[PDB]
């Protein structure tokens, strides 16, 4: 054998994480869709009762 002309080693290969562009309505994530609708139905319900 001659002198090593290139060094190497056992490396790890994982899937490159994408940019993960958030959705347009990403701000509606902390509250579920059921909560947002129930708020609107409770909003109109309180208004009619108040009237």
């Amino acid at each position: 054998f001659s002198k090593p002309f290139m060094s190497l080693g056992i490396s790890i290969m994982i899937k490159k994480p994408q940019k993960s562009k958030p959705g347009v309505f990403s701000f509606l994530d902390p509250l579920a869709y059921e909560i947002w609708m129930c708020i609107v139905f409770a909003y109109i319900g309180v208004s009619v009762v108040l009237f």
């Binding site: 059921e34 129930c38 139905f41 409770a42 109109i44 319900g45 009619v48 009762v49 009237f51």
Partner: protein
């Protein structure tokens, strides 16, 4: 004009809410088996057609309300009690006070209708992507039309007194 838009709305809200609680096509889960209120009829469950009743058995107070679905039914009972109160405009007229008794029942059913869903969603969850069928959206119209009929029944009572 508004005297007739209330009687047609009571029969278009009670007759529409009784259908949403009758047909069992509220929730679509995954085989894909469509769900319902009192019983779910399975599909693609190793059998062609199967439809069996669900078995629900201080958190026990929520399970009995989900099993004995009284809130989505009490709203339909108040819709018919208020539907006959506005029907008393012809017979025994000139009272000017029975119309107010209908404006209370028309909104008391809306409070018992939004509750019937809170006890239904909290018990549903208590990954698996589930959707709401066309039969579940019918109950939503039983609350919107319950508020328009609750603003049109009281407005007449104010005009009659003024």
């Amino acid at each position: 004009v508004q005297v007739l838009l209330t009687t047609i709305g009571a029969f278009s809200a009670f007759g529409l809410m009784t259908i949403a609680i009758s047909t069992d096509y509220w929730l679509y889960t995954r085989g894909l088996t469509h769900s319902g209120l009192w019983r779910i009829c399975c599909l693609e469950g190793l059998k062609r057609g199967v439809c069996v009743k669900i078995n629900h058995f201080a958190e026990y107070l929520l399970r009995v309300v989900r099993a004995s679905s009284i809130f989505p039914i009490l709203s339909a009972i108040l819709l018919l009690l208020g539907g006959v109160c506005v029907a008393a405009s012809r017979v025994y007229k000139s009272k000017r006070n029975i119309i107010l008794g209908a404006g209370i029942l028309f909104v008391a059913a809306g409070l018992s209708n939004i509750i019937g869903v809170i006890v239904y969603i909290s018990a549903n969850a208590g990954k698996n992507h589930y959707s709401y069928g066309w039969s579940f959206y019918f109950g939503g119209l039983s609350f919107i039309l319950a508020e328009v009929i609750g603003v049109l029944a009281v407005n007449i009572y104010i005009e009659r007194s003024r």
